[PDB]
Design a protein around this ligand. Structure first.
Ligand SMILES: CCNC(=O)Oc1ccc(-c2csnn2)cc1
Length: 282
């Protein structure tokens, strides 16, 4: 069923809450035993948001390989994403170890460091060129190269150095700075514009490791970003763009990380984004 007609039918019937609970009921339940070990308590931001064992990213170290991060592998779309929590004071070094080890080109940040008067993630990148950051626990150096501030997003060029080998790489930081503290954006216009700058950059392409995507918990805004990107790519690839079922794509993604899309408004917004996205190429 053409999702735009499906959309108007759910709006006129006011049934977003019912559709969203049906997704919650059908979603996969896999173990997260490593996340719950007592040694990992200060590596989790939220007690109820954990990576599954089967899809978790492992750090390359014998001491403790754990990070709150998941590999979402979309077979038909030929896209992979790493979805992770906003880094904590004691996991900023782990975060950058993961970017290095997975060969990522891009980091996508969908939150502000402070929202609703509380800290949603650590200040994990340098704010000035001449004040670089050293992560002693993982042996990495991070330098700000340039910053481009726009009305709805900021792009940063960063240099990550593995101090063990003196190898360096360029990382691109895509920071969506205008998601409102409550609810979802009135239009998906700027969020859809933001996605195409990340793509534009090469950060989502198969010559690189998977993009790292985060918000505060790494399931709500982060889930909206990957769901919109995958649905748009499938509508390009297939003979019948109307065969793309957003609810079925979301349940496929929930095989790899729990809780993706946190509210009926984020669902409605995700539908809105693809519908309005499919339409702008016409
Ligand atoms: C209000 C919508 N228009 C807008 O602001 O920007 C864009 C940019 C790109 C796409 C796209 C290409 S392939 N799937 N979606 C959609 C919208």
């Amino acid at each position: 069923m053409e999702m735009e007609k499906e959309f108007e039918q759910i709006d006129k019937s006011g049934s977003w809450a019912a559709i969203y609970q049906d997704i919650r009921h059908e979603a996969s339940d896999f173990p997260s035993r490593v996340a719950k070990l007592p040694k990992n308590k200060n590596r989790n931001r939220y007690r109820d948001v954990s990576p599954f064992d089967h899809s978790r990213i492992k750090l390359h170290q014998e001491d403790n390989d754990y990070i709150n991060a998941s590999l979402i592998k979309m077979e038909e779309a030929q896209r992979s994403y790493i979805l992770t929590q906003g880094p904590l004071p004691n996991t900023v070094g782990h975060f950058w170890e993961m970017v290095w080890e997975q060969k990522s080109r891009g980091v996508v940040m969908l939150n502000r460091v402070m929202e609703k008067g509380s800290l949603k993630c650590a200040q994990y990148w340098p704010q000035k060129e001449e004040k670089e950051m050293i992560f002693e626990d993982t042996n990495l150096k991070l330098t700000l190269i340039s910053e481009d501030i726009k009305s709805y997003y900021t792009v940063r060029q960063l240099e990550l150095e593995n101090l063990t080998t003196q190898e360096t790489r360029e990382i691109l930081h895509f920071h969506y700075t205008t998601w409102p503290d409550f609810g979802v954006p009135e239009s998906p216009a700027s969020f859809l514009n933001f996605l195409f700058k990340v793509r534009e950059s090469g950060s989502l392409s198969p010559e690189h490791g998977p993009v790292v995507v985060h918000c505060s918990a790494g399931i709500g805004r982060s889930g909206t970003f990957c769901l919109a990107d995958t649905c748009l790519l499938l509508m390009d690839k297939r003979k019948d763009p109307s065969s793309v079922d957003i609810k079925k794509v979301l349940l496929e993604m929930r095989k790899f990380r729990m809780g993706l899309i946190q509210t009926a408004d984020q669902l409605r917004f995700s539908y809105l984004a693809v519908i309005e996205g499919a339409k702008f190429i016409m």
